[PDB]
């Protein structure tokens, strides 16, 4: 992890970056801020290129579509909690997801959005914004406090609240047993495994493949090729405070063997991987959770 670039929010007493994602445009990074702005920065120079007001509270998460035409944002407490924006021609609002505090695109064909409202998953059509499906079964729920619904790589399956759903049939296929209070789990890009906190399960048999203690209370992301997994531990759950602690870990995504532990000695707000297994960007807070304001920087690392 060679540092390449660092920058703070331009012309700001304290810097308020809260999240990041690589643009479809080379050399440009999208950043959310604590005042609900979306900014485009040159990641090498640190120059601010564009700014748009998206939310009336901190942006917590953002996801660009692969083709560069659409963007999902989420905010902490304002209404709507999540939104879809068009980024061709004039930056515009396409749809609002009033009470969904987390959203993702579908993965294979990016024609749908999946939103989370507490224990409930909502699936929407991008074109119409219509809610197509609600996935929720009170009898199967794990009631994970930090539930996030997600599609699998082929968009055929959803994981919501530790329940595996077949989308087409809107059938609960399997409920994974609950071994933590918070984390609901994600699909491995390999399409064969799910990672639910410290447990790795096989989708073809439902057997436990691996225990990975270091993944406790972690969010994870993969590099472009799905050969490396990055994890960072959430802080246990007024301005937005650092969602993560000060370390992230890398793992071989084929065998879950630890590769590196990186303590950046600053609490982490977000991490994003590029689309070419080359660069990582990290939002790091110079300030503590007791500071009046956050004072974040974006570091670009070569991996
Ligand atoms: C605390 O509430 C406000 C918040 C927040 C928040 N900011 C970034 C993320 C996040 O998960 N980012 C991914 C990457 C991504 N963009 O999905 C991430 C993967 C691995 C890493 F090592 C690192 Cl540091 C971050 C989150 C987040 C937290 C909790 C849950 Cl349940 C869901 C979330 F999206
Ligand atoms: Cl600038
Ligand atoms: Cl806020
Ligand atoms: Cl827990
Ligand atoms: Cl903080
Ligand atoms: Na730089
Ligand atoms: Na705002």
* Residue 70: C-alpha distances to residues 75, 128, 130, 213, 273 (Å): 17, 14, 17, 36, 18
Q: How far apart are CA 95 and CA 90, in angstroms?
A: 15
Listed in sequence order, the residues at least 6 apart from 113 whose beta carbon sits closer than 8 Å to its beta carbon are 72, 84, 95, 97, 103, 104, 105, 106, 123, 124, 126
Listed in sequence order, the residues at least 6 apart from 296 whose beta carbon sits closer than 8 Å to its beta carbon are 8, 9, 15, 16, 17, 18, 269, 283, 284, 285, 286, 287
**How many whole angstroms from 16 Cα to the centroid of ligand 6?**
18
18 closest CA partner among 205, 270, 191, 218:
270
Q: For ligand 1, atom 30, which residue shows the shortest CA distance?
A: 146
Q: For ligand 1, atom 6, which residue shows the shortest CA distance?
A: 60
Contact between 122 and 115 (Cβ < 8 Å)? yes
CB atoms within 10 A of CB 94: 16
**What is the domain extent for residue 22?**
2-302
Ligand 1 near 113 CB (within 6 A): no
Ligand 1 nearest atom to the CA of residue 20, by list position? 16
Work out whether the CA dihedral 288, 145, 282, 263 comes out positive or negative.
positive
Coil, helix or strand for 221?
Answer: strand
Q: Identify which of 118, 261, 270 to mutate to test ligand 1's pocket (most ligand atoms within 8 A of the CB).
A: 270
Q: State the number of CA atoms in the 13 A half-sphere of 129 facing the CB.
A: 12
**How many whole angstroms from 152 Cα to the centroid of ligand 3?**
30
Q: How far apart are CA 217 and CA 241, in angstroms?
A: 17
Q: Domain count of the chain? A: 1
Q: How far apart are CA 21 and CA 64, in angstroms?
A: 7
Q: How far apart are CA 62 and CA 59, in angstroms?
A: 8
* SS3 track for the chain: CEEEEEECCCCCCCCCEEEEEECCCCCEEEEEECCCEEEEEECCCCCEEEEEECCCCCEEEEEECCCCCEEEEEECCCCCCEEEEECCCCCEEEEEECCCCEEEECCCCCCEEEEEECCEEEEEECCCCCEEEEECCCCCCCCCCCCCCEECCCCCEEEECCEEEECCCCEEEEECCCCCCCCCCEECCCCCEEEECCEEEECCCCCEEEECHHHCCEEEEECCCCCEEEEEEECCCCCCCCCEEEEEEEEECCCCCEEEEEECCCEEEEEEECCCCCEEEEEEECCCCCCCCCCEEEEEEEC
DSSP of 166-198? ETTTTEEEEEPPP-SSS---EE-TTSSEEEETT
Contact between 295 and 285 (Cβ < 8 Å)? yes
Q: What is the CA radius of gyration of the chain?
A: 18
Contact between 73 and 88 (Cβ < 8 Å)? no
Region of residue 85 (phi > 0: left; psi between -120 and 50: alpha; otherwise: beta): beta
Contact between 71 and 54 (Cβ < 8 Å)? no
- Domain of residue 88, CATH code: 2.130.10.10
Ligand 1 near 271 CB (within 6 A): yes
User: Resolution of this PDB entry, in A?
Assistant: 1.8
Ligand 1 near 41 CB (within 6 A): no
Q: How far apart are CA 191 and CA 95, in angstroms?
A: 29
Ligand 1 nearest atom to the CA of residue 248, by list position? 22
Q: How far apart are CA 59 and CA 270, in angstroms?
A: 11
Q: Identify which of 219, 223, 229 to mutate to test ligand 1's pocket (most ligand atoms within 8 A of the CB).
A: 219
Q: For ligand 1, atom 8, which residue shows the shortest CA distance?
A: 270
Q: How far apart are CA 224 and CA 47, in angstroms?
A: 26
């Amino acid at each position: 992890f060679r540092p390449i670039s660092v920058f703070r929010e331009a012309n700001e007493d304290e810097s308020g970056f809260t999240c990041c994602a690589f643009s479809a445009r080379e050399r440009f990074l999208m950043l959310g801020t604590c005042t609900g702005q979306l900014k485009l920065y040159n990641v090498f120079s640190g120059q601010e290129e564009a700014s748009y007001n998206c939310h009336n509270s901190a942006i917590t998460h953002l996801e660009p579509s692969r083709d560069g035409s659409l963007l999902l944002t989420s905010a902490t407490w304002s209404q709507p909690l999540s939104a879809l924006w068009g980024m061709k021609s004039v930056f515009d609002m396409k749809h609002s997801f009033t009470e969904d505090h987390y959203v993702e695109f579908s993965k294979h064909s990016q024609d749908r959005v999946i939103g989370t409202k507490g224990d409930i998953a909502h699936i929407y059509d991008i074109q119409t914004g219509n809610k197509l499906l609600t996935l929720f079964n009170p009898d199967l729920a794990n009631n994970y406090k930090r539930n996030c619904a997600t599609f699998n790589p082929t968009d055929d399956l959803v994981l919501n609240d530790g329940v595996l759903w077949d989308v087409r049939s809107a059938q609960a296929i399997h409920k994974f047993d609950k071994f933590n209070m918070n984390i609901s789990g994600v699909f491995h890009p390999n399409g064969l495994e799910v990672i639910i906190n410290t447990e790795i399960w096989d989708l073809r048999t439902f057997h436990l493949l691996h225990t990975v203690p270091a993944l406790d209370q972690c969010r994870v992301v993969f590099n472009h090729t799905g050969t490396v997994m990055y994890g960072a531990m959430l802080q246990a759950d007024e301005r937005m405070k650092s969602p993560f602690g000060s370390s992230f870990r890398t793992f071989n995504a084929t065998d879950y063997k630890p590769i590196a532990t990186i303590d950046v000695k600053r609490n982490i707000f977000d991490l994003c991987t590029d689309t070419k297994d080359c660069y990582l960007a990290v939002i790091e807070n110079q300030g503590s959770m007791d500071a009046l304001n956050m004072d974040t920087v974006c570091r670009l690392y070569e991996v």
